[PDB]
Amino acid sequence: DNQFYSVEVGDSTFTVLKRYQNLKPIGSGAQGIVCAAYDAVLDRNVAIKKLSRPFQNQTHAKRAYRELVLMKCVNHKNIISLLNVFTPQKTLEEFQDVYLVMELMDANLCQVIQMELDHERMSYLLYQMLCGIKHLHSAGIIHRDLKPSNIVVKSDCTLKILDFGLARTASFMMTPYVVTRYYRAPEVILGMGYKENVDIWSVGCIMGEMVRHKILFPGRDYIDQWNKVIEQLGTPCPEFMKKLQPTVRNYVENRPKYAGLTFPKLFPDSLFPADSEHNKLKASQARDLLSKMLVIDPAKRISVDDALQHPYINVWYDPAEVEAPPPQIKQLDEREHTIEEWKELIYKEVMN
Numbered sequence: 441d442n443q444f445y446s447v448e449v450g451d452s453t454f455t456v457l458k459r460y461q462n463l464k465p466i467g468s469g470a471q472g473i474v475c476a477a478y479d480a481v482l483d484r485n486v487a488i489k490k491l492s493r494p495f496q497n498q499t500h501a502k503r504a505y506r507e508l509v510l511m512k513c514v515n516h517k518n519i520i521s522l523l524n525v526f527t528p529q530k531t532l533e534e535f536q537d538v539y540l541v542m543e544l545m546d547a548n549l550c551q552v553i554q555m556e557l558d559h560e561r562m563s564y565l566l567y568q569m570l571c572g573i574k575h576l577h578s579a580g581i582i583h584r585d586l587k588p589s590n591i592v593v594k595s596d597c598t599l600k601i602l603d604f605g606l607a608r609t610a611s612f613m614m615t616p617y618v619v620t621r622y623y624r625a626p627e628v629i630l631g632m633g634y635k636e637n638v639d640i641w642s643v644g645c646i647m648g649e650m651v652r653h654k655i656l657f658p659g660r661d662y663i664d665q666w667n668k669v670i671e672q673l674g675t676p677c678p679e680f681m682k683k684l685q686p687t688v689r690n691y692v693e694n695r696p697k698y699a700g701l702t703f704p705k706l707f708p709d710s711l712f713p714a715d716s717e718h719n720k721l722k723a724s725q726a727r728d729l730l731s732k733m734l735v736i737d738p739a740k741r742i743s744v745d746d747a748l749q750h751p752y753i754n755v756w757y758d759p760a761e762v763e764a765p766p767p768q769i770k771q772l773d774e775r776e777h778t779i780e781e782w783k784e785l786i787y788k789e790v791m792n
């Protein structure tokens with residue numbers, strides 16, 4: 441009668457509490473493998489993520505720890521919530537793996553992106569991304585890495601963000617897995633200091649992908665990515681370069697120039713539901729919002745608050761969803777530690 445049992449998924453051994461049944465692999469993420477399971481105590485399905493030796497390096501260890509603390513203390517319909525945490529190992533020395541148990545949704549945004557959504561749905565998804573982001577922002581968490589693979593949806597269009605983004609500071613990782621850059625803001629690509637609206641860029645990139653069914657700026661590296669950006673939106677006016685460091689500013693002011701394209705050209709009428717008057721008016725509103733989110737210079741880019749006040753989005757506005765009490769966060773939450781120290785930190789958190 442041990443409280444745990446073991447089953448194979450690919451080359452993984454999941455060792456989980458006996459309550460969780462019928463493990464099925466649904467994903468091979470970044471820090472871990474993810475499984476769907478039935479939880480016999482709660483009487484519902486759930487997602488279970490195995491973190492392997494998350495203390496292996498500092499990037500894994502910071503993400504895991506940040507994940508743990510933030511997920512324990514954020515409670516919001518639009519950020520995935522933690523049902524349960526555990527390790528099968530019994531002491532600090534045998535300690536190896538962390539399992540997070542979370543509510544199970546039906547799909548991620550990547551699958552949604554390959555379908556044609558009506559405006560009521562697309563706008564609802566977007567409204568919900570903005571709510572979740574606003575909530576993070578109100579606890580001083582700026583995400584910096586929204587991407588459709590860390591967003592998930594249910595069949596009834598409810599949506600939740602999976603992760604809490606980048607760690608403020610940051611670095612190297614021995615991996616076969618390459619990290620996705622396509623939704624990262626100009627200020628992050630050019631390392632120039634960011635604010636809250638850094639997450640609006642990512643949103644606009646996702647909305648733009650939703651409409652076009654094609655990653656907007658699919659670069660192999662940050663160089664390529666910046667080219668794909670200026671090709672379309674055009675070279676940022678002088679005022680924005682003035683804000684860059686002369687070292688990178690040099691590089692930027694030295695690319696081929698682009699007048700760059702107009703929003704009707706970037707996102708043509710054909711891409712939108714536009715047969716009834718409702719839909720023509722919505723399309724117009726959709727394109728208006730994109731043109732304010734996909735703005736290179738964050739001084740000119742729309743904010744989360746304004747984008748929630750936007751016509752396309754405003755319809756769903758609920759002050760319960762939008763002005764929810766901020767999470768209370770641990771303080772040094774951009775800290776440096778040896779691997780032995782990270783193991784301690786994480787273990788203590790898994791055990792409370």
Ligand SMILES: CCCCCCn1c(=S)[nH]c2c1c(=O)[nH]c(=O)n2C
Pocket residue numbers: 466467474476487488489520542543544545546547548592602
């Ligand atoms: C048979 C249902 C497939 C739904 C997959 C959605 N999904 C993905 S993908 N990853 C996660 C989820 C999820 O719902 N909850 C989570 O905690 N994570 C990590």
